[PDB]
Symmetry: C3
Amino acid sequence: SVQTAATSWGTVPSIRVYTANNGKITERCWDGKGWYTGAFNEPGDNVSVTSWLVGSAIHIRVYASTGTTTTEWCWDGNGWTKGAYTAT
Amino acid sequence: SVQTAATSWGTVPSIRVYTANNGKITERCWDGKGWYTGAFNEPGDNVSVTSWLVGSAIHIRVYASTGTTTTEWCWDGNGWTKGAYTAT
Amino acid sequence: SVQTAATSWGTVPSIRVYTANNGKITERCWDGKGWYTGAFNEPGDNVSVTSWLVGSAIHIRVYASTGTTTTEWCWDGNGWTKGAYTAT
Ligand SMILES: OC[C@@]1(O)OC[C@@H](O)[C@@H](O)[C@@H]1O
Ligand SMILES: OC[C@@]1(O)OC[C@@H](O)[C@@H](O)[C@@H]1O
Ligand SMILES: OC[C@@]1(O)OC[C@@H](O)[C@@H](O)[C@@H]1O
Ligand SMILES: OC[C@@]1(O)OC[C@@H](O)[C@@H](O)[C@@H]1O
Ligand SMILES: OC[C@@]1(O)OC[C@@H](O)[C@@H](O)[C@@H]1O
Ligand SMILES: OC[C@@]1(O)OC[C@@H](O)[C@@H](O)[C@@H]1O
């Protein structure tokens, strides 16, 4: 079936839910005022996530896997980009 | 195989492990005194979870997926009910 | 495909990413100075993780599933061992 991963921060809270569906990962967002579709959209059959909130900054790492390849996607306040993670 | 999701809170800690097995999700609980079966029992082939502890209250969100449909289940101190999450 | 689970702690942060690939789970680690392969290596087709940081101690629980059997693996500062978790 589709596969999801979820993270949250703060006391509102903010929630992010990533869904791998038919080889694509998309993102749904809650910040206390309704669910909406987030900027994250990348290929993947499987997804995991972790996040850490430091001061006023949320940092999110999304691990997107297709076949035997995992790509780390990083949110550090300014859009999503690929991170240095490799599986080795 | 079966698929799991896990969350924890506090310093004991409390742990909740959700297992999607044969289309059903069940919950195992640790609060420092042995594992036991929790109240959560809902359909699903895939599960993710996030939680946040505010004051004396734990809030848990379990995302249960079957086919292309994801249902959010909410614990806010008074049993499990479906939440407003949709995948859109 | 391969399946992952991720956790993080502190402000560096430390990150651990577990990958179930071809029936084996391995671990990649970030502590602020490059990714490296961690000590965790156990059988599994599916993996989830949770962790909690208390004082100077990180506690990690990895739930590794093969077929209908889930094994909990515990890090409490001194290597990985099986924990008391059962699915019942
Ligand atoms: O709009 C909210 C948003 O910026 O929050 C941080 C990340 O979750 C982004 O993908 C998302 O678009
Ligand atoms: O700032 C990005 C980065 O350094 O963050 C920590 C890890 O997620 C790394 O893989 C990643 O490249
Ligand atoms: O009995 C413990 C319990 O109430 O803890 C909160 C939730 O995890 C519930 O499903 C569970 O039954
Ligand atoms: O109190 C329940 C609720 O508002 O909590 C925040 C989100 O999980 C929503 O989808 C959900 O309906
Ligand atoms: O070397 C870093 C390490 O000790 O960190 C704690 C656990 O993640 C271990 O598996 C790992 O080897
Ligand atoms: O110290 C190990 C242990 O007691 O930690 C809490 C739970 O993870 C238990 O299953 C596990 O045996």
